[PDB]
């Protein structure tokens, strides 16, 4: 018949990467997780105790609980017309810090830093990010750079 076991359709999600099988590198247990940290979920298949369900692999959510060897992660979940809250028992072997949040955090220190000097001199320090603006005008010189012409190449079998 049909099976929907706790770990079905995971032939490749819990495979250890090529030449990355075996022991988990020891920095994993050394990273410190504080309630409020934003972490993602990448279940290294080697550690079998405390694996997440295959739906959460890649889902990024905050940490709400910190335990002896596990941490509690909150993940929003698509169920019908509403998002549910899913509190997960996750061994730290399957998680890592999200590098997206730290980029925002270091930016905040950068925003605070440049606003600090803006307090002294140079008001209107333009805190907000700017997307890629349309490129301004420029002069394209031709010293030694005469535009060399091109012609479409005739079809050749090349076989």
């Amino acid at each position: 018949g049909k099976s929907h076991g706790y770990r079905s359709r995971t032939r490749y999600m819990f495979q250890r990467d090529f030449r990355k099988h075996g022991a988990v590198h020891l920095s994993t247990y050394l990273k410190v997780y504080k309630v409020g940290d934003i972490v993602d979920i990448k279940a290294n298949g080697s550690i079998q105790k405390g694996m997440p369900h295959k739906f959460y692999q890649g889902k990024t959510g905050v940490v709400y609980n910190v335990t002896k060897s596990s941490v509690g992660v909150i993940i929003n979940k698509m169920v019908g017309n509403r998002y549910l809250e899913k509190r997960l028992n996750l061994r730290v072997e399957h998680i890592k810090h999200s590098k997206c949040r730290q980029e925002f955090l270091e930016r905040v220190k950068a925003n605070a830093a440049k606003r600090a000097e803006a307090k002294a001199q140079g008001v209107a320090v333009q805190l907000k990010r700017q997307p890629a603006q349309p490129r301004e005008s420029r002069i394209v010189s031709t010293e030694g750079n005469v535009p060399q012409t091109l012609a479409p190449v005739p079809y050749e079998t090349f076989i």
């Binding site: 022991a23 247990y29 050394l30 990273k31 410190v32 060897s69």
Partner: protein, 292 residues
Amino acid sequence: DAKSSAYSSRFQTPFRRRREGKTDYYQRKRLVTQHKAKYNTPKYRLVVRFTNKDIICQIISSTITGDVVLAAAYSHELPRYGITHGLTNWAAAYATGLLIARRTLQKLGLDETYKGVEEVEGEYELTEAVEDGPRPFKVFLDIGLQRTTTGARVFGALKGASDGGLYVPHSENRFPGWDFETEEIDPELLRSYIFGGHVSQYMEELADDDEERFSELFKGYLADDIDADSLEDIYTSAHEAIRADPAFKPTEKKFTKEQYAAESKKYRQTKLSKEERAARVAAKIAALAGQQ
């Protein structure tokens, strides 16, 4: 022996310190991991190692990017404390065990309390936390790849450290002088090991029986003319000396590290460059095809 490309292409080398064999990562996972409700409280490891002609015991906390050392009291420093001839025996491990204990306690501000055991009978007396006082510095022994075995030197340092006040969790099962009928360590026998009685009794029994082995061996002893029963004195004198001043100083040194680098650079084999790598192949291609 003439391996193919497939073996080399898909070979997963274990972590470097396992390739060299010096590090056991299976234990290290459960020696460096921390109860996460103790977020940034580093776990201290009493690392004990046995090079030949020395003993290395350390207190190490494993941070993210490596391991920092509180204090590292090797055994080739016991000459400044008094023990000179014999730097690996069971008594030497116990002496450096108490040394690395007192050194860090005097470093972390707990010298005044936790005096360990002053009169040492080698009893399994763990340093209980003093009422209304800071808890004893709890360190965890990390023997390494060596084998747990009754009467081992690494557990000699273990008993030495705990007897120095540095509360390290352990049990009396693997101490020397163990009885399989009664689960107790013989105080007379264990303290004999502490003062190096096992070495001393071996010497005096050799001197009783023969002269050749007693003379070919222990010829460090012969220079200073110290009796077998005089070992307890020098060990006890050094034990109090270690208690007196374990603060440690680095050796005076000669030829400052700049001279160390300068002289080592000349003898150290250097590495060629790509132009030189391409230069010499011309010699080899000329030699192997020059009218050959």
